[PDB]
Amino acid sequence: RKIGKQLPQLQTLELQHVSPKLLSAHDLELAVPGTRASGGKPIVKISKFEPVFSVISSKQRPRKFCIKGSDGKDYKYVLKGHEDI
Amino acid sequence: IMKDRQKTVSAALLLCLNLGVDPPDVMKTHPCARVEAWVDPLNFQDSKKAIEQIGKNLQAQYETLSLRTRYKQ
Amino acid sequence: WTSLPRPLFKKLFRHDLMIAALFRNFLLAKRIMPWYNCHPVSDPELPDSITTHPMWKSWDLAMDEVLTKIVID
Amino acid sequence: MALNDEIFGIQLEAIKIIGRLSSVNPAYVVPSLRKTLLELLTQLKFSNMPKKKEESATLLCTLINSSDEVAKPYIDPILDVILPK
Amino acid sequence: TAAIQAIMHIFQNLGLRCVSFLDQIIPGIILVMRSCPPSQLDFYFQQLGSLISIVKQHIRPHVEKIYGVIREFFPIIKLQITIISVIESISKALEGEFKRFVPETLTFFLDILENDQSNKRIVPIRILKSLVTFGPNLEDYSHLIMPIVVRMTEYSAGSLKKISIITLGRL
């Protein structure tokens, strides 16, 4: 009862609250996890993540996620669990 | 002193702070005075600081004046 | 002690520690708060020499002396 | 209150009297010395007239000579004004 | 002039509900301040005083900008009466947070006092009626003008002499 009462009260997850390491998780040469092109491909540089997230009521509750890009354009993904993708 | 002591033993901490909504009788500037008992209402989302952090810090600060008084908020 | 009359000083500062500490802090409030166009009020009224008492300068110098050590540390 | 008087010689000798008393009853002298030092340091940079600048500068000279107790901890604020002059 | 009096009229008739556009209007008026001849600067500052007298506190994120405007435009050719009208209007509409910037307007007041006193010293009379309005504000800066108003009670004429001594008494 208490867990299922508090669970619909987290519409936003705080980055420092869920992971202290995410604050320093920057300046890594790994690209955004959707870009790949053999031969001619510009280097994609991961810069930063916003502290705030969001959830969607779906019985599995995915997480909308975004990354500040070196190109200056935000890269928005959605993270899912308990479902093979 | 005649040793007649009127001790204080109990406290009520009335905190009418519904964070997010303002009264309709006072205009406000877009940046306004919002920190309360050294905890900021933007770092916590809706109600983890509406009472259960501000009142905790306020009770901890009131403990310094008299440690032999119990509090309930 | 310097400003207040003796019966009021006995009634407010010697009887119990909790009320003594709160009015001790109210003495500081009666100086800090009127710097920002707000005047505090007590139910047993206090003389207004508190906010113009000359002795606060030593307390300011005490803060300066401690904060110099803090900044050099 | 003779520290603010008409003839400048009155101020020049009154601040020396204050500096001399700065080791007799220092509890009631030193904070007032801090107050007048701060007042003079504010006026020395927020005033814009050469005779006022002159009077403030040499009042600071005679004060710093006549009292060594209020001297040492205030070296940084008293130099940050005089040095760009 | 039409583009500014339209906004003046709608704000004056409407009131404290169009205040959400202050993030656009005053940055839109400082660019007009920047490039304009002194012919209409009096009108602009008068209308800005009119804005201030109806919108009191929400000017707070732009008061540094309005003193910046006055600082890089504080000549004799600008209407000093209009400038001190702007100062008294913003001071009265602000009423309490004035501590951050007393010396700026106070040095401007020194310049106004020591620049011109002609035509029966109407501008010194207005500035001595403006210094008394400041109230408890001078609790820590009462060492600059107080010697000045002590000095100007015997080194000037008699029209504003009583004004100066009344300023001393009221302070």
Swiss-Prot record, chain A:
Coiled-coil region(s): none
Which residue ranges does the record annotate as region G-loop?
Answer: 55-61
Compartment list: Cell membrane; Vacuole membrane
The domain of life is: Eukaryota
Assembly and binders: The target of rapamycin complex 1 (TORC1) is composed of at least KOG1, LST8, TCO89 and either TOR1 (TORC1-A) or TOR2 (TORC1-B). TORC1 binds to and is inhibited by FKBP-rapamycin. Interacts with PIB2; following activation of PIB2 by glutamine. The target of rapamycin complex 2 (TORC2) is composed of at least AVO1, AVO2, BIT61, LST8, TOR2 and TSC11. TORC2 forms a homodimer. Contrary to TORC1, TORC2 does not bind to and is not sensitive to FKBP-rapamycin. Interacts with SLM1 and SLM2.
- The protein's role, per its UniProt record: Phosphatidylinositol 3-kinase homolog, component of both TORC1 and TORC2. TORC1 regulates multiple cellular processes to control cell growth in response to environmental signals. Nutrient limitation and environmental stress signals cause inactivation of TORC1. Active TORC1 positively controls ribosome biogenesis via control of rRNA, ribosomal protein and tRNA gene expression, and rRNA processing.
Q: Which family does it belong to?
A: Belongs to the PI3/PI4-kinase family.
> What protein does this entry describe?
Serine/threonine-protein kinase TOR2
Q: Please tell me the species this chain comes from.
A: Saccharomyces cerevisiae (strain ATCC 204508 / S288c)
UniProtKB/Swiss-Prot annotation, chain B:
User: What subcellular compartments does it reside in?
Assistant: Cell membrane; Vacuole membrane
The similarity comment for this entry is: Belongs to the WD repeat RAPTOR family.
| Summary of the function given for this chain in its UniProt record | Component of TORC1, which regulates multiple cellular processes to control cell growth in response to environmental signals. Nutrient limitation and environmental stress signals cause inactivation of TORC1. Active TORC1 positively controls ribosome biogenesis via control of rRNA, ribosomal protein and tRNA gene expression, and rRNA processing. TORC1 positively controls protein biosynthesis by regulation of mRNA stability, translation initiation factor activity, and high-affinity amino acid permeases that serve to provide amino acids for use by the translation machinery.
Q: How does it assemble?
A: The target of rapamycin complex 1 (TORC1) is composed of at least KOG1, LST8, TCO89 and either TOR1 (TORC1-A) or TOR2 (TORC1-B). Interacts with PIB2; following activation of PIB2 by glutamine or cysteine. TORC1 binds to and is inhibited by FKBP-rapamycin.
Q: What is this protein called?
A: Target of rapamycin complex 1 subunit KOG1
